[PDB]
Amino acid sequence: DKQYISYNNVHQLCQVSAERIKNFKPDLIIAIGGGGFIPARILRTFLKEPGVPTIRIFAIILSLYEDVKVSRTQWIDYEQCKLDLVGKNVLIVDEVDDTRTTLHYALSELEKDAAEQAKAKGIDTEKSPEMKTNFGIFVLHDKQKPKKADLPAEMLNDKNRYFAAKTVPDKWYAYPWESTDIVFHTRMAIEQGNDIFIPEQ
Amino acid sequence: DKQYISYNNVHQLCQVSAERIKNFKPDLIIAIGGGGFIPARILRTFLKEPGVPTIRIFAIILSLYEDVKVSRTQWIDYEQCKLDLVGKNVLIVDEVDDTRTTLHYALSELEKDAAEQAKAKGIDTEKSPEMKTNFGIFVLHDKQKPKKADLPAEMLNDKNRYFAAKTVPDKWYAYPWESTDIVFHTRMAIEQGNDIFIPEQ
Numbered sequence A, B: 001d002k003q004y005i006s007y008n009n010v011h012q013l014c015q016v017s018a019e020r021i022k023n024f025k026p027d028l029i030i031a032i033g034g035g036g037f038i039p040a041r042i043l044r045t046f047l048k049e050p051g052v053p054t055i056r057i058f059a060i061i062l063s064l065y066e067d068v069k070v071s072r073t074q075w076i077d078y079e080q081c082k083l084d085l086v087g088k089n090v091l092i093v094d095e096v097d098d099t100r101t102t103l104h105y106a107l108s109e110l111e112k113d114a115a116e117q118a119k120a121k122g123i124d125t126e127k128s129p130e131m132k133t134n135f136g137i138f139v140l141h142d143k144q145k146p147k148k149a150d151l152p153a154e155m156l157n158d159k160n161r162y163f164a165a166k167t168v169p170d171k172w173y174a175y176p177w178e179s180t181d182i183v184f185h186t187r188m189a190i191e192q193g194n195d196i197f198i199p200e201q
């Protein structure tokens, strides 16, 4: 029993979520895999405000192994990119929250990068808090079920640090960019109510 | 006079292009900006062959300035990623070819990386030509107008090295992930015959 998602749906999800996200006032977006990149890119179009330069999106690939083992398959070369996580608001993007495992470590590893950058600059997060980095999360879908790992309480709780376009029942979702027959995929999606929901203007 | 492109169209363009591209037998994809990432990601779904691991996609941002000036805003950290361009077939992806300027330098800079990564490896493409790197290009659209830059002739000639989904006229194309009203954008696209061109199965 699959749930078919149309491109246009993913687009409207980002759209509505764009507003709530506008608070967190992100300084940059870090996208997990290609899965998180597509919505991240769309998400950007909506966060564009006249004059203000367009927010940057950094893609990262993260591999998790067992017998937990983390592996930075593709990471941000802060060096050559000249990216400073210090005192910035980072928004982590990925399509769906299943067991939360992925975001758990994604946040984790990125936090290490922040705190270690802070040292390198000679700063003390303790003595001078404001210098700390504020992390945010954004997912199209957040499955409601038993999560096999977890994200820090204060964030997971604040409705302006963790955004789930939609929270949905434990099922398997097929995303437009995965299908080898978009036409079928689409027809299905429309038949399950997974197409638009915000009529034209 | 804009040309509205639907997500589903971009999807089918990749689909058909997937075949011709299957020859070049790409070892990895390097995507220019988010623009090239979305189609690159889709393109992947179609290149998947049972058993064989899924091809990797590397995103890069390239800034070009004048008064030409190149700036690696975001590049591939071959180091930590453990990526070897030597003797591999790289496919460069980006949504549209306008003045070719972008791809000109994108290819250029990436070629430097291959060369320098080839020499410092203790090899020479002259005596051992089975090691040089073969570059490929893929764009949804390739506008026909007089270009401002240029790619090597042997590549822009061999129809198994330069892939352009649909070769379009000189106009301005609005891509789905750019629109702030997908519904309108879509209706328009369908009315210009810029939606699907292949049916279900």
Ligand SMILES: Nc1nc2c(ncn2[C@@H]2O[C@H](COP(=O)(O)O)[C@@H](O)[C@H]2O)c(=O)[nH]1
Pocket: A035, A094, A095, A096, A097, A098, A099, A100, A101, A102, A103, A171, A172, A173, A174, A175, A178
């Ligand atoms: N297409 C699709 N991928 C899923 C689904 N649930 C999980 N995934 C994939 O599995 C990864 C694991 O997420 P986690 O379980 O660690 O929170 C996701 O990022 C995503 O790539 C689903 O319903 N549909």
Ligand SMILES: Nc1nc2c(ncn2[C@@H]2O[C@H](COP(=O)(O)O)[C@@H](O)[C@H]2O)c(=O)[nH]1
Pocket: B035, B094, B095, B096, B097, B098, B099, B100, B101, B102, B103, B171, B172, B173, B174, B175, B178
């Ligand atoms: N949306 C859109 N972007 C375009 C169009 N033509 C060029 N661009 C943008 O301009 C860049 C310049 O490409 P170049 O002119 O250097 O070959 C493209 O990669 C793309 O981001 C168009 O018709 N529509």
